[PDB]
Write an enzyme that holds these catalytic residues in place. Structure first.
Site, short mmCIF file in Angstrom:
data_model
loop_
_atom_site.label_atom_id
_atom_site.label_comp_id
_atom_site.label_asym_id
_atom_site.label_seq_id
_atom_site.Cartn_x
_atom_site.Cartn_y
_atom_site.Cartn_z
N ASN A 1 -2.82 6.67 0.30
CA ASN A 1 -3.28 5.22 -0.42
C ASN A 1 -4.47 4.86 0.49
OD1 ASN A 1 -3.01 3.42 -2.39
ND2 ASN A 1 -1.43 1.90 -1.40
N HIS B 1 -6.42 1.01 1.91
CA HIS B 1 -6.22 0.64 1.57
C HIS B 1 -7.88 -1.04 2.15
CE1 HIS B 1 -3.95 -3.52 2.30
NE2 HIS B 1 -4.83 -3.73 3.54
N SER C 1 -9.09 1.37 4.78
CA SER C 1 -7.69 2.71 5.55
C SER C 1 -7.52 3.60 4.37
CB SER C 1 -6.72 2.11 6.20
OG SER C 1 -7.71 1.66 8.00
N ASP D 1 2.36 -0.29 3.14
CA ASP D 1 0.87 -0.49 4.17
C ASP D 1 1.63 0.12 5.92
OD1 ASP D 1 -0.10 -0.53 1.43
OD2 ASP D 1 0.15 -3.41 2.27
CL LIG Z 1 -2.40 -1.05 -1.31
#
Ligand SMILES: [Cl-]
Lengths: 187, 190
Positions: A108, A110, A137, A146
């Site tokens: 994912n 971020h 990130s 996260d």
């Molecule tokens: Cl996110």
């Protein structure tokens, strides 16, 4: 010692991060590895990214369940039978149960220097922060929101940038780091 | 306009950041300001930073923290010596003593910390920031509030971890420290 890396990209709306990953990876050969997106998934039919996916000859697999465990079971199903080696979460706005996170190798993106500023309002909170640096990130998806193992992150200096200029730097750093992220994983 | 910025520097050991402050600011004139370190203070008599200070002709006041029963009495003596030095800003550069409100409520001070605050507070920042799964690290300069390592941030710089060993990681950290700290002091007075 060659690789064909099949990718799945999950999205729920716009299709920006989805389209950026296609232009730089879909059927493109980079180094000793060749990449292709074998799955584009959406949970809302009205999302615009579906027609964006149709611009690469990619049909999109389409809040329709009262059960999250039953919903995530289909996600895992589609990703697996696609032969995807890695799943890339791009603007995918849904909470994923361990049904997904325990059985799918996913990454994912971020817009903050994790573990700092977890959650949705990362860009806002990081700009208003008294911190002088910010960034983006890429991390593995785990049961912890996260909190997965950080893959890559790039940092920059906030300086006297306005919120518009700051936000534009994040969205630019994203488009850099995210396609690059997949590469390092297999090199 | 050309003020004489008086600086007090506090350290505990090697005094590399102290020496770097002296090399960039002591008796030197940047912009409208002419900086002068009017106090070098250490809590350890065998610290090497004292010798680095001698080069610039500055003696180091030694206040053994073991020579006092409370942190408070230790602090009141720090205050008076900073006060009777006439310093305008106190710079904590490798000063390894927790400071009671006796200090923090009476002295305008900044601190150097080898991490990207508010991450890795404490005296194990470099080791923890290296072993961390984070791919970036750096340093910070912040005002000294009542909250430990939690004062308002005024300066930060980051570097990508990439493939540095801890020996090389530490070098890069101290490299940024030597750059960012004197610049912070200048940034405050302009
Ligand atoms: Cl996110």
């Amino acid at each position: 010692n060659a690789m064909l890396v099949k990718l799945a990209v999950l999205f729920s709306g716009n299709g920006s991060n989805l389209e950026n990953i296609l232009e730089k990876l879909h059927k493109k050969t980079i180094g000793e590895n060749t990449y292709e997106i074998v799955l584009c998934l959406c949970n809302k039919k009205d999302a615009f990214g579906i027609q964006r996916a149709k611009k690469f000859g990619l049909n999109t697999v389409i809040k329709a369940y009262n059960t999250r465990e039953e919903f995530d079971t289909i996600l895992v199903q589609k990703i697996k039978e696609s032969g995807a080696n890695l799943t890339v979460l791009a603007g995918f706005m849904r909470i994923l149960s361990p049904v997904f996170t325990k059985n799918i190798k996913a990454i994912n993106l971020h817009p903050s220097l994790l573990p700092l500023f977890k959650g949705a309002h990362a860009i806002k909170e990081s700009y208003e922060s008294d911190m002088k640096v910010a960034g983006v990130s890429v991390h593995w998806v785990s049961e912890e929101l996260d909190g997965g193992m950080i893959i890559a992150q790039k940092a920059f200096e906030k300086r006297n940038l306005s919120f518009e200029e700051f936000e534009e730097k994040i969205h630019s750093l994203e488009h850099e780091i995210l396609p690059l992220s997949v590469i390092e994983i297999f090199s």
